[PDB]
Amino acid sequence: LKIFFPGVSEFGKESILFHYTDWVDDQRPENYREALGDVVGDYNFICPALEFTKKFSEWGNNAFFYYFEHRSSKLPWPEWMGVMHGYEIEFVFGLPLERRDQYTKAEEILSRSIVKRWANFAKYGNPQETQNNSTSWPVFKSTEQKYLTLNTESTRIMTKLRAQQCRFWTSFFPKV
Amino acid sequence: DIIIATKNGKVRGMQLTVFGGTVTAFLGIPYAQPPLGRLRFKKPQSLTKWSDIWNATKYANSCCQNIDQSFPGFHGSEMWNPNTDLSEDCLYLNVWIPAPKPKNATVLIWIYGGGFQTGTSSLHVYDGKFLARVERVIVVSMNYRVGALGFLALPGNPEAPGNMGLFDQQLALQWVQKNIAAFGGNPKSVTLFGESAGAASVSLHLLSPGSHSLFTRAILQSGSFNAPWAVTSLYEARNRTLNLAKLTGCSRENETEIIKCLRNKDPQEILLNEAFVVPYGTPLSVNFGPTVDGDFLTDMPDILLELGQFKKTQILVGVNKDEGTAFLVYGAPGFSKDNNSIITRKEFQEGLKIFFPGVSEFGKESILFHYTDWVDDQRPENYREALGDVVGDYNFICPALEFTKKFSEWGNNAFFYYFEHRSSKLPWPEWMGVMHGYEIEFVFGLPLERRDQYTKAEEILSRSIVKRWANFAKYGNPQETQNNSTSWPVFKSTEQKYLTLNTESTRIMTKLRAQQCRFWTSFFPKV
Amino acid sequence: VQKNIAAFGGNPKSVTLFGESAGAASVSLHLLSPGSHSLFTRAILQSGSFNAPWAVTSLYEARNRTLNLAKLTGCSRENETEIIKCLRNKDPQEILLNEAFVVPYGTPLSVNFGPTVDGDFLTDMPDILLELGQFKKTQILVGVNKDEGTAFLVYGAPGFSKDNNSIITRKEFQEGLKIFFPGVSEFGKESILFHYTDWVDDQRPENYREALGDVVGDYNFICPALEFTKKFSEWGNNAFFYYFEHRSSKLPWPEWMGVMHGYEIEFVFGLPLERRDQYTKAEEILSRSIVKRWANFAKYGNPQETQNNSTSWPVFKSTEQKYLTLNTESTRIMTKLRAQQCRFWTSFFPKV
Numbered sequence A: 001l002k003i004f005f006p007g008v009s010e011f012g013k014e015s016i017l018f019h020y021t022d023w024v025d026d027q028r029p030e031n032y033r034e035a036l037g038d039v040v041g042d043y044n045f046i047c048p049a050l051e052f053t054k055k056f057s058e059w060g061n062n063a064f065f066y067y068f069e070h071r072s073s074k075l076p077w078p079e080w081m082g083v084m085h086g087y088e089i090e091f092v093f094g095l096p097l098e099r100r101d102q103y104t105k106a107e108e109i110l111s112r113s114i115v116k117r118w119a120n121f122a123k124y125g126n127p128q129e130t131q132n133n134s135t136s137w138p139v140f141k142s143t144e145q146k147y148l149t150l151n152t153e154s155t156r157i158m159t160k161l162r163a164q165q166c167r168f169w170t171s172f173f174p175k176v
Numbered sequence B: 001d002i003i004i005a006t007k008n009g010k011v012r013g014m015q016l017t018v019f020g021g022t023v024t025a026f027l028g029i030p031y032a033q034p035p036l037g038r039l040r041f042k043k044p045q046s047l048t049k050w051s052d053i054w055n056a057t058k059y060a061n062s063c064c065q066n067i068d069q070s071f072p073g074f075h076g077s078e079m080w081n082p083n084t085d086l087s088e089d090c091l092y093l094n095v096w097i098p099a100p101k102p103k104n105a106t107v108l109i110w111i112y113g114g115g116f117q118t119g120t121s122s123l124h125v126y127d128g129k130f131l132a133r134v135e136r137v138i139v140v141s142m143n144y145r146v147g148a149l150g151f152l153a154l155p156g157n158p159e160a161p162g163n164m165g166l167f168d169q170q171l172a173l174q175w176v177q178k179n180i181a182a183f184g185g186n187p188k189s190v191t192l193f194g195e196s197a198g199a200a201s202v203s204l205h206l207l208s209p210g211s212h213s214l215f216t217r218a219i220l221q222s223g224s225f226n227a228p229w230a231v232t233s234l235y236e237a238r239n240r241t242l243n244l245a246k247l248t249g250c251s252r253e254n255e256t257e258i259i260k261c262l263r264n265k266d267p268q269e270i271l272l273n274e275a276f277v278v279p280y281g282t283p284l285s286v287n288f289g290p291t292v293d294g295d296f297l298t299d300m301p302d303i304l305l306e307l308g309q310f311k312k313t314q315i316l317v318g319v320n321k322d323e324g325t326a327f328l329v330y331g332a333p334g335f336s337k338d339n340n341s342i343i344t345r346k347e348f349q350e351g352l353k354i355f356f357p358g359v360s361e362f363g364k365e366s367i368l369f370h371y372t373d374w375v376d377d378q379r380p381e382n383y384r385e386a387l388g389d390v391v392g393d394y395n396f397i398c399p400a401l402e403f404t405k406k407f408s409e410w411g412n413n414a415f416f417y418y419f420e421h422r423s424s425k426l427p428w429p430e431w432m433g434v435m436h437g438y439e440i441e442f443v444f445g446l447p448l449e450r451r452d453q454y455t456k457a458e459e460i461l462s463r464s465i466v467k468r469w470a471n472f473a474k475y476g477n478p479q480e481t482q483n484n485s486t487s488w489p490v491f492k493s494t495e496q497k498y499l500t501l502n503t504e505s506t507r508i509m510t511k512l513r514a515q516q517c518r519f520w521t522s523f524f525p526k527v
Numbered sequence C: 001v002q003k004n005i006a007a008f009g010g011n012p013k014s015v016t017l018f019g020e021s022a023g024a025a026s027v028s029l030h031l032l033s034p035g036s037h038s039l040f041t042r043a044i045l046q047s048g049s050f051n052a053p054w055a056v057t058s059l060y061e062a063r064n065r066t067l068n069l070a071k072l073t074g075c076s077r078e079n080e081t082e083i084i085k086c087l088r089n090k091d092p093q094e095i096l097l098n099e100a101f102v103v104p105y106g107t108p109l110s111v112n113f114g115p116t117v118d119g120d121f122l123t124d125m126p127d128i129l130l131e132l133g134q135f136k137k138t139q140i141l142v143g144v145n146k147d148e149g150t151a152f153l154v155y156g157a158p159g160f161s162k163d164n165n166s167i168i169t170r171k172e173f174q175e176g177l178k179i180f181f182p183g184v185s186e187f188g189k190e191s192i193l194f195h196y197t198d199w200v201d202d203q204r205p206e207n208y209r210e211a212l213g214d215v216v217g218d219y220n221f222i223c224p225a226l227e228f229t230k231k232f233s234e235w236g237n238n239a240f241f242y243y244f245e246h247r248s249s250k251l252p253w254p255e256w257m258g259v260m261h262g263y264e265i266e267f268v269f270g271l272p273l274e275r276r277d278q279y280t281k282a283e284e285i286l287s288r289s290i291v292k293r294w295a296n297f298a299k300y301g302n303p304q305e306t307q308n309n310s311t312s313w314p315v316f317k318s319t320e321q322k323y324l325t326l327n328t329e330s331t332r333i334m335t336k337l338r339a340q341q342c343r344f345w346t347s348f349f350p351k352v
């Protein structure tokens, strides 16, 4: 935290530790390794994108939010790093559609679907995949805060991604 | 010395140390006249009354029943087998109360599953002392008759009316209405809970006029009467009564004579022939089960449910992630608890033949069509997983979801869970996942016992479930209000919100198995 | 009263409990107690509710304190019915003299022996009863005073005196928290300092003196009464909330202590209606109005003063959170008393 939050008062940093180290439970050895990742990802990318999306949508416009949870089968980085920053991009641009490339079949299908959703968004303002009995992507509103998860098995509609975490980053931390 | 005076006599209980505190257990209190001799196959009769002290210091006889002998030596299956002597003289219940005696405790009454053919209240996974200790509720459980001896039916003939086992449960609920104040319980705050057939039973006490004033609220784990195994049609019931006659050489012409004959058979000759009263059966057969008898159950209960004719109260309903896998090792080709059971398309198809006896060929093609649209045809465990889902969705999950929708459409709060935690101690192999029956130990709080080798995340999960079930029972609302827990939303038609129960993060989701159940619920009943 | 008040001309079917501070907490627990449900009609809670941090003793602390008092009276035993037997031979005075010590640290707000979840009067942690709507369904009237917390500061906070203006320093403030929040981790206490010392601006010398008062009053009385009122009203019942902001003209305590805990009570009971007594005229009129509002609440479930073109008192709901201020000039309808403060006490602090 000292590395990621240069200063950042000591209280500022205790408050992060307090919010992120309430284990269930203190048993798991990878507790702290996972918490530091979540800290960095929640502060720097996830809570801000969620707050931009809420505020933007409050003026009337359709907005669609995704949570991408697929780890590339070819990721060169180790397992503990999971579904890393930057690694949705190859799915968006359709690299997995190239069969010569050693991505799995479930990855071809995932990328094909994302490519269609992004293109429909672009052409028609709506990121649906309308032809293959796909989960329909609901608009994101303040209040319900629905989002779509993107993964090779079942995509799901969920609500209020990182609610508690972002209440911390978004409401409180800007104050320290 | 703890002696309690009941309407029928005194009973002495015993003290138990639980978690550094004390629970008093009264194991094996009688609650009806033993159903022997002339009383075999009849509704349970009133208890007569005793002076001196009945000692309720151990579990009583379990009712007569066939036993699971498929895996001798194996805990996975042997844990469900009866653990007290079998006897027709089995109409007893158990009471567990916290110490010191509570003043007006809410009461939880457990009804066990076992397909209506087996089960007993004295299993270790139904031990109510943790709940009593931890939540200061009173837990009651009862033995009721199963198999032909509990459900034989010759429609409208009082010598074999049907539903005798459900009337055992009811008379036990009556016993609590009359006696639980004496143990410090509140007859006005009674919640029935049950799993599998015990849940189906709970769901029929919701429809039975005779049970309406014997309880307050209801919990249904992995079962409801609209499951395809839970209610026997009058047609099948006669066919099965006569078939059992024939097999015991009791065919007659006067039907009260068939029954008289049957009352001379030895329990063992009845049990031994139960399996055969049906030409084909499956790992999920319920040869003798609830019927519309015009007494306990006044009309086809699908009609009662649709038309809103049941007790208006809150319900809590749930199911497990892999309800269907347990049954596959009992007859589906290529399936074994001792390997990973990768089966083939042709085995899958044979498997359906095992689970759907007939079931037209179109009927079965339609299941294959709905469940074998892979994404994609690559994964070797595709067919093994599909067969599990087929069995679990048809038999437990879609029916519980449809019961919950229909019940809630008449105005009552209903709460639905999806239990997705696999026990760290499960003796069954990994591929079987979160099996039918294996939430029960979490509900009863076994993982709260640290000596027992459950993980820490499992203690915390069970502690939370125990609190949610107790809050449901006491207050009609399964919240855990103190530890920044996810709040459990009521289940409504339209949104269909449910709570997932697991050791990491519990989540609110919507429309469990939407596509699957559209298939089972709307279309399949038609084939 | 249920059995006898008809004989004195009273209606047992129209009974309103009222209480202040611990007496209000008591009223709020008769709302949760099944045994009290049919012994009263409505309830008034002045400066107190059971969810205040001082109002309910945990079973853990209660045993620790019973045994500690045994030990101090030389009544430690092994059979517990013997501890009690022993204790029943002590002289009242030996019990009283040791009460203060059954706890290692205490504060000016200690409640060493208070309500517990006994499985009889109180059947479950009452925070769970409140959250899940398990209480008597009826109207409530709830309120607090502008400076609930100041009274307690002259009983142990450094640099505070009833005999001067008590301008304290940042370092004294911090010591003061140590007095009111025994432990309470260091982070716990930094968080209070952070929330309450964001001045506008760092100029005013009475900054820290005022913050310590607000800290004590907000944690101990105001945010809890506001949270009780929200939660109670969410189950459907009319609830009315006041903010009392009048300082008695006869208050013997110094000016800096403002509108203190306990000092609405004389207005409620109508002492200022006695002209011989040296209260001002605006105080007679204020008390007359409060007496009528409390009596209308009691008789009719509605604390209006209907005859003198008075501000009408709106019910308190979740969402708008309207309250009425009680003062000698103009009473006003306002919303969301201490919103930011109580978000801190109510949502966050219980976590530290």
Ligand SMILES: *[C@@H]1O[C@H](CO[C@H]2O[C@@H](C)[C@@H](O)[C@@H](O)[C@@H]2O)[C@@H](O[C@@H]2O[C@H](CO)[C@@H](O)[C@H](O)[C@H]2NC(C)=O)[C@H](O)[C@H]1NC(C)=O
Pocket (backbone or CB within 6 Å): B239, B243, B244, B246, B247, B276, B277, B278, B279
């Ligand atoms: C109603 O029951 C009859 C009875 O048949 C059974 O005789 C019993 C004693 C028992 O041993 C049982 O296994 C045996 O089948 C059923 O009739 C049988 O149906 C099967 C399949 O259709 C035929 O192959 C048998 O020939 C036939 N037997 C007789 C005597 O007719 C009947 O199927 C059943 N009703 C249903 C639809 O399940």
Ligand SMILES: *[C@@H]1O[C@H](CO[C@H]2O[C@@H](C)[C@@H](O)[C@@H](O)[C@@H]2O)[C@@H](O[C@@H]2O[C@H](CO)[C@@H](O)[C@H](O)[C@H]2NC(C)=O)[C@H](O)[C@H]1NC(C)=O
Pocket (backbone or CB within 6 Å): B332, B333, B334, B335, B336, B338, B339, B340, B341, B342
């Ligand atoms: C997983 O085991 C099944 C179950 O049947 C077998 O159990 C094994 C552990 C072994 O002891 C074997 O003797 C026992 O019969 C296997 O299914 C069997 O597959 C074999 C193919 O060689 C057939 O001969 C059997 O008919 C069939 N058993 C039945 C009746 O269901 C299964 O093949 C095995 N699968 C694996 C290892 O992937």
Ligand SMILES: *[C@@H]1O[C@H](CO[C@H]2O[C@@H](C)[C@@H](O)[C@@H](O)[C@@H]2O)[C@@H](O[C@@H]2O[C@H](CO)[C@@H](O)[C@H](O)[C@H]2NC(C)=O)[C@H](O)[C@H]1NC(C)=O
Pocket (backbone or CB within 6 Å): C064, C068, C069, C071, C072, C101, C102, C103, C104
């Ligand atoms: C539970 O009570 C014990 C008892 O300690 C007390 O003994 C009493 C007779 C009384 O005089 C009281 O002042 C004294 O503290 C508490 O244990 C004490 O805790 C303090 C602070 O942690 C320690 O400094 C003492 O050494 C310790 N004494 C003993 C005998 O162990 C204990 O703190 C209390 N529980 C809590 C958390 O308040």
Ligand SMILES: *[C@@H]1O[C@H](CO[C@H]2O[C@@H](C)[C@@H](O)[C@@H](O)[C@@H]2O)[C@@H](O[C@@H]2O[C@H](CO)[C@@H](O)[C@H](O)[C@H]2NC(C)=O)[C@H](O)[C@H]1NC(C)=O
Pocket (backbone or CB within 6 Å): C157, C158, C159, C160, C161, C163, C164, C165, C166, C167
């Ligand atoms: C306001 O008074 C406080 C209270 O303590 C003092 O009360 C005074 C009226 C006086 O009689 C004094 O004797 C009495 O102790 C003062 O706090 C005191 O500050 C002095 C600093 O000189 C310290 O010596 C004391 O420790 C401290 N008292 C304690 C124990 O709290 C306070 O300084 C004074 N403030 C003013 C005048 O602004």
Ligand SMILES: *[C@@H]1O[C@H](CO[C@H]2O[C@@H](C)[C@@H](O)[C@@H](O)[C@@H]2O)[C@@H](O)[C@H](O)[C@H]1NC(C)=O
Pocket (backbone or CB within 6 Å): B103, B104, B186, B188, B189, B474, C034
């Ligand atoms: C025990 O409580 C009785 C009623 O309490 C219940 O009210 C019911 C309608 C139901 O909602 C329950 O969940 C409530 O708990 C009361 O009438 C009895 O007098 C009490 N018996 C005692 C304390 O002896």
Ligand SMILES: *[C@@H]1O[C@H](CO[C@H]2O[C@@H](C)[C@@H](O)[C@@H](O)[C@@H]2O)[C@@H](O)[C@H](O)[C@H]1NC(C)=O
Pocket (backbone or CB within 6 Å): C011, C013, C014, C299
């Ligand atoms: C006194 O009034 C009794 C009822 O009046 C009360 O009704 C209650 C439900 C409650 O709302 C109170 O506030 C009402 O004032 C009536 O039944 C008695 O008979 C009366 N007794 C007398 C006049 O002797």
Ligand SMILES: *[C@@H]1O[C@H](CO)[C@@H](O)[C@H](O)[C@H]1NC(C)=O
Pocket (backbone or CB within 6 Å): A109, A112, A113, A116, A129, A131, A132
């Ligand atoms: C639709 O599904 C088919 C397989 O049925 C697949 O070939 C194709 O990739 C899908 N189209 C899109 C846009 O995903």
Ligand SMILES: *[C@@H]1O[C@H](CO)[C@@H](O)[C@H](O)[C@H]1NC(C)=O
Pocket (backbone or CB within 6 Å): B053, B054, B055
């Ligand atoms: C009941 O148990 C007690 C054990 O103390 C015994 O005194 C009494 O004889 C028992 N009654 C029986 C076994 O019939």
Ligand SMILES: *[C@@H]1O[C@H](CO)[C@@H](O)[C@H](O)[C@H]1NC(C)=O
Pocket (backbone or CB within 6 Å): B254, B255, B256, B257
């Ligand atoms: C059948 O036998 C019963 C039993 O004794 C008898 O009561 C009845 O009369 C008989 N039924 C008829 C009339 O066929």
Ligand SMILES: *[C@@H]1O[C@H](CO)[C@@H](O)[C@H](O)[C@H]1NC(C)=O
Pocket (backbone or CB within 6 Å): B460, B463, B464, B467, B480, B482, B483
């Ligand atoms: C609340 O959480 C605490 C840990 O902070 C734990 O000890 C306890 O099990 C929890 N209570 C419930 C009902 O889960």
Ligand SMILES: *[C@@H]1O[C@H](CO)[C@@H](O)[C@H](O)[C@H]1NC(C)=O
Pocket (backbone or CB within 6 Å): C079, C080, C081, C082
């Ligand atoms: C404790 O003493 C009480 C008071 O006489 C007595 O009733 C009881 O038997 C004792 N408790 C035990 C068994 O330790």
Ligand SMILES: *[C@@H]1O[C@H](CO)[C@@H](O)[C@H](O)[C@H]1NC(C)=O
Pocket (backbone or CB within 6 Å): C285, C288, C289, C292, C305, C307, C308
């Ligand atoms: C109404 O106002 C009059 C003065 O016009 C005053 O005498 C009296 O105190 C008031 N009544 C109430 C209930 O305040």
Ligand SMILES: *[P@@](=O)(NCC)OCC
Pocket (backbone or CB within 6 Å): B113, B114, B115, B116, B195, B196, B197, B198, B223, B229, B284, B285, B286
């Ligand atoms: P349930 O009682 N349903 C089976 C028919 O589960 C145990 C087999």
Ligand SMILES: [Cl-]
Pocket (backbone or CB within 6 Å): A024, A025, A026, A027, A028, B456, B457
């Ligand atoms: Cl852990």
Ligand SMILES: [Cl-]
Pocket (backbone or CB within 6 Å): A160, A161, A162, A163
């Ligand atoms: Cl999340």
Ligand SMILES: [Cl-]
Pocket (backbone or CB within 6 Å): A105, A106, B375, B376, B377, B378, B379
């Ligand atoms: Cl695949």
